[model samples]
Target: AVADKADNAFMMICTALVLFMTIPGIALFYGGLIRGKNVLSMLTQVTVTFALVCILWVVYGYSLASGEGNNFFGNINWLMLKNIELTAVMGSIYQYIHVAFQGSFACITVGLIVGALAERIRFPAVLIFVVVWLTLSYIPIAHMVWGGGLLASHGALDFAGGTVVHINAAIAGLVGAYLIGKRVGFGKEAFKPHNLPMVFTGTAILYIGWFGFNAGSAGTANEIAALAFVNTVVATAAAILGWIFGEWALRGLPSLLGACSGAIAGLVGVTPACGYIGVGGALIIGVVAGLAGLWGVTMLKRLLRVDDPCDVFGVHGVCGIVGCIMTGIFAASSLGGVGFAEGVTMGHQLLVQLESIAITIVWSGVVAFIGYKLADLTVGLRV
Candidate 1:
């Protein structure tokens, strides 16, 4: 089948948008959250890794992850994009566009993990870990979900990437954080964000870029895309309100950081359900995600006894799980969703979502531990 011109154009835009989330968006966000001395290092890791993932994706990463193969991974049929035709259509768009768009997602997922290990790990270790984890962790997870592998076969409802992107990256980040240990003076000294304005700027960019991330999952500029777009708006807005209210009630004041965090929380929460659920479901998911993120960063962080500087696990990991679980409920037609697949009950769908979540957590966690250990033994883990 021939590719559609409109979808080709739309995917090109979305590809650019996703890449933007990693370069200046995540760079600035993570940069502002760390101490002044390590900001440059963090930015460097993000920049180099963004380029690294792009290069790796085209070389063999895309083929292995997206190709047709067993339940865990795809074959190397498209290695170096050697045999695939330029005119190939993934959905309605050119196959090349699919490559770029998917590669961008890989870049952002790596970017997210680096934030958790910020200010503590060595730069060389970061590059090493990215190579190992991107190959072992990110590739298999992406294949299992979007590449019509294990999760896809199980009828998982990840419209975008609650499992493939957020949970996958978050678990890896948390593992790395634990393995590398905490930054100096983590508990004794107040590690305030160096620049709230910069954080807000990156948050704004991420929020804007997420439209492509969510809507573009539809792969067409159609009703599903429209639904995802509007869902992104309402869910993010509701999350902002929920976070600030929680902040005000708990801390007696709202904060810029709280608001920005809320935006991301909402975005991650709705990411999986945006194309499937109604506006009302989006709002509820946003609110729940906001609160869950707040709790994860505060109580859960303490309970886990890990030093996650940017709350990558707290927001992305926690909200990603919340969003995925809620997706099972909201995706039911009874709850104003697009409805479950034929013959699949709500209980069964919920179980599938949980299983997918558990599998991702365990898989990424194990891969991350190995990646961190390799980085540790080779060039050392800590700065």
Candidate 2:
């Protein structure tokens, strides 16, 4: 297989884009959301975990999450990148580029989980949780969705990583928030963010980086990539309006925080369908995801009784599910999507989408529970 230089360069840049999302993007976002006293701790956690995931990804994460294997995971064929040559080609790009690109996804997923555990989690506990979760939950989900595992076999339609990245990490964050218990004075105190500007900066970075995230999934400089790029822009813009409108109506005034959160909600919402759905479908998904994210933070947060400070489950979890389910609907050729696989109907596809969501929720939730428990037993989860 011949590697295209254009594709190679594009993937390398996209890989860097995804990596920056975790290092500075998530670091600043979560750091600003946390109290000043704990901001450094959160940043340290993010930085360390980013490096940790990168290292582990090269070792076994790439092997277990990619290549050919069973329904749950791939074999360790790429262990330490043993057998793969430098010239190995995957989808018109070098396999090394693919490895880094996929590994960046793994890094960001772990980065998302740390935000919920910020403020009160022990550093060692955080490390332990990351190791367990990344190994058990993130790897398997990546395999199932992207590596042609069970969900792929069932015709699941995740153009990017709605299930693997957002839903998988969100549930883990929710579980950690509950397990670690609410931060001290969570209900009584104001618990205000010390640095809104930093949060906005992080949001801006995530917005730019997500283009690489959504479009880069195409793995080529092609029409699908261009469509994904346009859909990302259209959906994210619509979602901003949707969130601002909803916030204005409910809270009596729109705020900067709502705008920033809206942007991320839109980005996450359009992620899975960006490459497959049309502009119209992207617009609808963006609007729905924005409102859904608001509901998740306000209503679902109350019902769940968890003090997820960053609302990881709220935005990523809720919008991810909404995007995934809507993908099943909007991806119909009749509705201007790229269309479904032959022999597949809308109803069947919808069922498959729902099934993938449920499986991810259950699988990630279970693994997260185990991960937290292990962390608790070893170094203690709460500080």
Candidate 3:
């Protein structure tokens, strides 16, 4: 019964903001990227899988992720929230609020993956992939990072969900891109976005909603929340400038798309460090993320040679890794960050961050491979 009513109010609104990212926000962003002929199909998959992930979160996701068991698993005592009382408090907030807030993350993560692949993927195949991936990969990573698992115990910093949401979903998207193969006209046909304005609108929505993602991770209406909120604003502004400048310098003309992409890069890069680092660090990460995001789409995408229609892996995965690694450097007393745990040297913390990112990549890759395979074996992977 130690909940603060103000904290409760903050978290509840934060939860709604996150949910907003998936519904019209993600749908609009992705919708603009896809073809008109396939709009209905993609919407059906995103909306339905969103519902499915929500249901799974209530039934078992919350239990395993936050219930406390081991480094990689949680106790089942809180399954369906059966044993928790209405008065139970967690992190200065009501338990139910936490459940909804955290579960909203899972929903948005799945929606991100589903949106990138839905253009040419079978509806049934997408459903099966979401089910398997959410269960094995997403949940385990959540436990490890935020639920006091191996990574969190090692002092890895993730203010919100850089690893759990961005990196995890990006890897899955990349793997699926390869496994499912590219669209028929990937190289030849122009996959022009149907509506650039819609994409900009969606990007705007995601930017606003991300305040909840970063600041609210403080789990209280406190100073940390204030810092996170400030970092979010400045970092995003820096990234937008970095991206447009890069595009104008390299691509000749700064397109609206570049501006939108830059905004997202900043958002992703700051997510892991917003709660731990200061505004200076946030600004540095933002510009670097913007540049890295452009490289991801241009250079890394070529290296991977996958026909990712929306560049999901590029923006999310690259920025996620950048943010995570920089967190190790920036979260120092000397660098205006919150500083690391006692006896944890900067080098050691960086190593821990790399290890955590590696683990997330491999785990998500394996689970994504298996999830796609399962879908292939059952409903078939290709459209």
State each model's CA lDDT, in order.
Answer: 0.87, 0.88, 0.88
lDDT of 1 by residue, 1-383 (tens): 78999989988998888888887888887766777777887887888888889999999899988999989999888988989899888889999999999999999999998865756888889889999999998999999999988999999999889999999998998887667765455442443654778888999988888998999899888899999999999999988888888989989999988898899999999999999999999999999999888877887557555433557567999999999999999998888899999899999999999999999999999999999999999999988
Which lDDT tens digits does candidate 2 get at residues 1-383? Answer: 99999999988998898888887898888766767777888888888988899999999999999968999999898999989999999989999999999999999899999865756789999889899999999999999999999999999999989999999999998888768765455442432655778888998888888988998999987899899999999888888889988999999999777888888888899988998899999999999988888887887556655434557567999999999999999999788899999999999999999999999999999999999999899889888
Candidate 3 lDDT tens digits, 60-176:
999999889899878778878889898899989999999999998999889888888887788999989998999999998999999999899998889988899999999999898
TM-score of each candidate?
0.97, 0.97, 0.97
Q: List the residue pairs that clash in candidate 1.
A: none
What lDDT is reached at residue 143 by model 3?
95
Which runs of model 3 end up more than 4 angstroms from their true locations? 186-194, 300-308
List candidate 1 segments past 4 Å from native: 185-188, 191-194, 300-308
Instruction: Give lDDT: candidate 1, residue 195.
Output: 76
Stretches of candidate 2 off by over 4 Å are 186-194, 301-308
lDDT over C-alpha atoms for residue 304 of model 1: 54
